[PDB]
Design a protein around this ligand. Structure first.
Ligand SMILES: C[C@@]12CCC[C@@](C)(C(=O)O)[C@H]1C[C@@H](O)[C@@]13C[C@@H](CC[C@@H]21)[C@](C)(O)C3
Ligand SMILES: C[C@@]12CCC[C@@](C)(C(=O)O)[C@H]1C[C@@H](O)[C@@]13C[C@@H](CC[C@@H]21)[C@](C)(O)C3
Ligand SMILES: C[C@@]12CCC[C@@](C)(C(=O)O)[C@H]1C[C@@H](O)[C@@]13C[C@@H](CC[C@@H]21)[C@](C)(O)C3
Ligand SMILES: C[C@@]12CCC[C@@](C)(C(=O)O)[C@H]1C[C@@H](O)[C@@]13C[C@@H](CC[C@@H]21)[C@](C)(O)C3
Ligand SMILES: C[C@@]12CCC[C@@](C)(C(=O)O)[C@H]1C[C@@H](O)[C@@]13C[C@@H](CC[C@@H]21)[C@](C)(O)C3
Ligand SMILES: C[C@@]12CCC[C@@](C)(C(=O)O)[C@H]1C[C@@H](O)[C@@]13C[C@@H](CC[C@@H]21)[C@](C)(O)C3
Ligand SMILES: [Cl-]
Ligand SMILES: [Cl-]
Lengths: 515, 515
């Protein structure tokens, strides 16, 4: 006779009763209290259901940040449906791929800034374009607009018994290979994530969070959109980051938190200097020194532990930053320890647990593990093999029990019989105090496929030779993993997106012979 | 392909890897680190499985507090079995009832203080006594002892795929009628409860909790045994409360928390005064003023909100104190608002939602709701009707959205066509500033079954008449709910257990004619 666990719908139904006059969401001139939000969600759900959307059905969002993203997630959630929050910077080929892959019943799109890509993509789909398209930033009466579609639904709550293990949020992720896959996050995934984040950040109903991170990425949901929603705080939306509008919203909405990277913080600070505008309610998590005393430094566990400075490990498929230095105290390893909804093992290629200090694939079980990728039957079977989710990230356990994240398992060398993970070698070299960064590649060898080569970037105030790098590796890693040679560079090549460009390293330094 | 949620077994498996040298449990001379505890749990699980215990099977604990209670819960949990932590003060009739009801495969019992009751109870069971009995506080080699049974198991983890919705902890509760029923708490119930409690109390791996509350009751598990376990802190066991031993453990184990009622606090303080023993690490939640500066006042949300002083509502069946003033800010209602794993509605007799201010039965859905009572098919069907758990507690929602707990729904008057809940009338009278407490009973009326009568206890420094009590009620409650007469008393009659004695009020004041 026992009932379901809590769903995202239950959260809104509770907030509308417990917090009748509190502001849930702000987006430009739109201000919605909990009951006004839940009413809109019910009307939206009514219209979605009238259009044939039910359990397991799919809605794709192709816009920037909006309060409507939260409405759509809640409304789909009340029907047991799911929303993909798409990457609004997709070019037409990638947008077409995602539309065909996800196969949505409904697409909610944005005109501003992306109408050209959208038009190109619909042209490409041709006779396969059978979804309903609704323009979110339309005139309010536009019959092909979101608001008109929503207004046509009734106030009644659908009141269905939705299983919270159902996917509700789908976020596309890219492998190093460039292959993209939609990670299925359930109600339970999001609630467990949000509950842990509320402990990490000391979040409560007085939190006012600026949704200045992209909602197509897990970061903004974890820190701090979903915990703010869960604890009945106020979510303030900005479409994307424009420093002046951000500053204005921080002040006008009295924000306590925001998702801001250091270059944005510096921009905000420069334009606020000697204006007298009060940013002191903002709890500075990232780059506290950059704020020049204008914000208050965060004293939550998130900041105190170093997690805010990157001391942790996670991925979309673990509902975000699931391992951190805020769990379990001081840590020799760079990532800390798993939080409450997760257990982690480091597994070798044979699926056996690695010894302390031995590098292997980070694998996980627990409430924060995603439900799999959408439409990836073979990949899912492989990646959930033996009842563990395989992250494709390489790590090790330290003697104190903490974890170190080394890099990906998807780069591998094979030198004669020996599999070698460059990430392990890179991390070893990067411990040398003269080294700022190191990239490891494989170069062809006619007798045993590949030799190991390191491309090393020194700190400006340091010097070290090829031989000294090689000897540094001797006591730390297996002999066959050491670089045969070392090239020095001023900096590594990087992609337009800021990631390491291994194709470029391979082209420059004679890389080849990979498995 | 997606996996299970987190189980209690996963918690111990993670802690043994992440916290290899930290102390998990202390009980007299026993000190167990996380790996030593998980090893014992694996040996215990091996022996339990060898004896035929598997999914859905049942172990009854008839002892006082022990580290072995945590071991048994974990070991049963790894098999998908459940442990009833019995009321060690049961007299033989109640002990026999519980044994026959719960029908355990194994009974782990305690000689000290209760051997006579146990012997009487086994005599009564006669030829129906077919369970294995293991003495927990035996000589270590006793072949009918717990330690010998455990030592015979192997170190291998059973490594089963246990559904965490499975009951793992069973706690007996008593209705006002005196009927006793075992509430089924799942792994998920306990973990969700523990996660919320860790936010409430700011619990982490440095917490050191003294298990000085009874483990047969939900209080000690919620505040703070289970969150301490979840966050990898140290649980220190005391068999029962003896002020001097408690004081010694608080100091020697450097406890940060304990489950202590005010009379016990005052006893500890009296015996610590001018000894110089340092109690300053203890975070005083209850009765902070009674500590005379010897402990540090708790600054967590639990204390700051008033929850620690009783501003909240819960029951075993909601995994404890599930509604509190720490959730959602200031509250007009005495109980506050529901925490994250719960939604609450106040429902009238017809199952429709009550208006703001109208008294009705507190009903719940969500992750913290129990799985039902053991062996109560008809009661469970009735109490989970319409997909809500019915608490049998009477409450109302206030205009600000908070909740007030009024009393039980199991006391009811029926005066002609009108159902009247005395708890509603009592709460109304108790708002009068002259009134310390009020009890309401029904007295026979030959024309319409019952009239309402109030028994009122005044504050010592106040005076108020019968008529003034009646007129106080006029604008606050329906006319037919007002007392027809008021008797004044120096204090209410109470049972040996400290609860109100309505049988005694009925006998003294002419009560009768109940539905
Ligand atoms: C602003 C960011 C982050 C938020 C999401 C984006 C999409 C946005 O425009 O709203 C984003 C834009 C990025 O080009 C940028 C800009 C700058 C700072 C962070 C991000 C950096 C490091 O060069 C990357
Ligand atoms: C987004 C995180 C978490 C998940 C895994 C990552 C790889 C990712 O990009 O998906 C990750 C990236 C981290 O730089 C970051 C960014 C921000 C917020 C969380 C994480 C914080 C605190 O500075 C750490
Ligand atoms: C915006 C992201 C994600 C999408 C693809 C990228 C390439 C991009 O610029 O569009 C990417 C850029 C990343 O520096 C960033 C920026 C910020 C937020 C997410 C990503 C974070 C966590 O620091 C990582
Ligand atoms: C100590 C308590 C609470 C813990 C569990 C008990 C069983 C125990 O002995 O360990 C318990 C004993 C109760 O008679 C008592 C004693 C005193 C203070 C609280 C409890 C009060 C109010 O008169 C009730
Ligand atoms: C045990 C609680 C919670 C559940 C429902 C109750 C009725 C019960 O006895 O079962 C409840 C009793 C409360 O006096 C108490 C006791 C202690 C700890 C929690 C609750 C605290 C903080 O002083 C509040
Ligand atoms: C010990 C309890 C529970 C069992 C039955 C009782 C009668 C008893 O004395 O044995 C009971 C006594 C309650 O005052 C108490 C004491 C403490 C802890 C639980 C119960 C709490 C929460 O303050 C309520
Ligand atoms: Cl739902
Ligand atoms: Cl398990």
């Amino acid at each position: 006779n026992a009932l379901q666990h809590t769903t995202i719908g239950d959260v809104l139904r509770e907030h509308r009763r417990s917090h009748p006059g509190r502001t849930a969401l702000v987006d430009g001139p739109v201000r919605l209290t909990w009951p006004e939000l839940d009413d809109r969600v019910n009307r939206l759900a009514g219209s979605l259901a009238a259009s044939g959307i039910g359990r397991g059905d799919r809605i794709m969002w192709l816009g920037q940040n909006s309060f409507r993203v939260y409405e759509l997630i809640a409304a789909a959630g009340k029907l047991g449906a799911m929303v993909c929050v798409g990457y609004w910077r997709w070019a037409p080929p990638e947008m077409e791929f995602a539309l065909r892959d996800f196969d949505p019943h409904l697409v909610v799109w944005q005109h501003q800034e992306i109408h050209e890509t959208v038009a190109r993509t619909r042209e490409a789909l041709g006779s396969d374009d059978t979804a309903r398209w609704l323009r979110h930033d339309s005139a309010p009466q536009d019959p092909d607009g979101y608001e008109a579609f929503l207004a046509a639904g009734g106030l009644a709550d659908p009141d269905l018994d939705i299983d919270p293990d159902s996917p509700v949020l789908v976020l596309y992720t890219a492998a190093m290979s460039g292959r993209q896959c939609g990670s299925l996050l359930s109600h339970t995934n999001l609630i467990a994530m949000a509950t842990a984040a509320a402990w990490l950040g000391d979040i409560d109903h007085t939190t006012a969070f600026l949704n200045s991170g992209p909602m197509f990425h897990i970061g903004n949901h974890q820190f701090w959109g979903m915990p703010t929603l869960l604890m009945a705080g106020k979510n303030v939306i900005v479409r994307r980051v424009v420093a002046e509008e951000v500053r204005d919203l921080l002040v006008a909405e009295e924000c306590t938190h925001a998702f801001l990277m250091p270059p944005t913080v510096a921009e905000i600070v420069r334009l606020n200097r000697d204006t007298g505008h009060d940013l002191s309610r903002l709890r500075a998590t990232v780059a506290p020194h950059l704020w020049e005393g204008m914000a208050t430094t965060d004293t939550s566990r998130f900041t105190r532990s170093g997690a805010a400075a990157g001391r942790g490990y996670g991925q979309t498929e673990l509902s975000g930053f699931a391992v951190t230095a805020a769990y379990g105290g001081p840590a020799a390893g760079n990532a800390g320890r798993p939080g409450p909804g997760l257990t982690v093992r480091v597994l070798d290629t044979a699926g056996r647990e690695c010894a302390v200090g031995e590098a292997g694939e980070i694998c996980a079980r627990g409430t924060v593990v995603h439900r799999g990728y959408w439409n990836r039957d073979e990949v899912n079977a492989h990646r959930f093999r033996s009842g563990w989710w395989h992250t494709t990230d390489l790590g090790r356990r330290e003697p104190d029990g903490s974890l170190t994240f080394l890099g990906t398992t998807t780069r591998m060398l094979k030198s004669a019989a020996e599999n070698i993970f460059p990430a392990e070698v890179e991390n070893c070299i990067e411990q040398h105090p003269a080294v700022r960064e190191a990239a490891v590649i494989g170069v062809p060898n006619t007798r045993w496929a590949q030799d190991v080569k390191a491309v090393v970037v020194l700190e400006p105030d340091a010097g070290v030779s090829e031989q000294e790098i090689i000897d540094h590796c001797r006591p730390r890693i297996a002999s066959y993993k050491k670089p045969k040679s070392v090239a020095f560079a001023a900096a590594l090549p990087r992609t337009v997106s800021g990631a390491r460009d291994y194709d470029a390293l391979d082209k420059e330094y004679g890389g080849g012979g990979y498995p």
